[model samples]
Target: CKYCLQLYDETYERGSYIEVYKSVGSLSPPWTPGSVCVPFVERPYWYLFDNVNYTGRITGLGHGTCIDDFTKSGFKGISSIKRCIQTKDGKVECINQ
Candidate 1:
């Protein structure tokens, strides 16, 4: 498995977190996420989107990424998180991508 992404509900990456290994089409309440941390990934980046299904404006979190507030950067409403959907013809998605 690749590196897992951490989703935080409060600023400065505090409070409870949702650890995601796969893409989340939609993010619900209690975990709307004020901040996110993505690092040590197999790929160069993972993206945060304002719309579901990985649509709308995207915020790219590269290796060693650690954002305390998504709203402060003009990229608000992170409704979806995208990792890897297609990984060529390989077995796993993220690692193969």
Candidate 2:
């Protein structure tokens, strides 16, 4: 879950961090508290959406290939391409080779 947020934080060029976080989950009943929170372990990722009035809204990441270069306009989502590697301190140093 943290990694998901990290990925979003690193690559979310469309929306604010709070808005992206809101897409994750809610705090209500039935549909609220819909996710289980586990300590010391990453929780499952989820995208919550409200269906009031039936308008379709995608609240989560969708199927796509990994992206190494943002200059490629059509590239979407994370990829297996090793563009940048993470360091021990969580710094994502860019890879140009």
Candidate 3:
């Protein structure tokens, strides 16, 4: 499975940014505590959390889409993540938990 997420800073600097945690399964903390993630991109259906270790509210992200702002999803920022289902094979199914 191929999955990725792009994290952005509050400053929204064009050149100053970080793109980490790319793979299948749970995601590592891509931002420090108190940092703000203005926007992010997910490859497929994903669940982002307010805290690490896959805890806290799980914001479900639809397959193959980008969220320009977290507030739109009732979230201020994202700290951790978990890819939910694989929608590329024309079938909706959850990945290994």
- Who wins the TM-score comparison? 1
Off by over 4 Å in 1: 28-31, 85-97
Task: Provide TM-scores for the models.
Answer: 0.69, 0.20, 0.50
On a 0 to 1 TM-score scale, where does candidate 1 land against the true structure? 0.69
Model 1: lDDT equals 0.68
**lDDT at position 20, candidate 1:** 81
Stretches of candidate 3 above 4 Å error?
10-15, 22-43, 88-97
For model 1, how big is the CA root-mean-square deviation? Answer: 5.5
Across residues 1-97, which tens digit of lDDT does each residue of candidate 2 receive?
3333223222323322222232322322212211112112222233323432212342332212222222332322222211223445644433223
Error of 1 at 88 (Å): 17
Q: What is the per-residue lDDT of model 3 for residues 4-38, given as tens digits with 9 covering 90 to 100?
A: 44554433333245543432334444443222232
A best-first ranking of the candidates according to their lDDT comes to 1, 3, 2
Residue-level lDDT tens digits of model 1 in 1-97: 2566887888898988878887788975413578888765435457777777777777767655788885586566777877743233423344332
Model number with the top lDDT: 1
Q: Work out candidate 3's RMSD over C-alphas.
A: 5.8
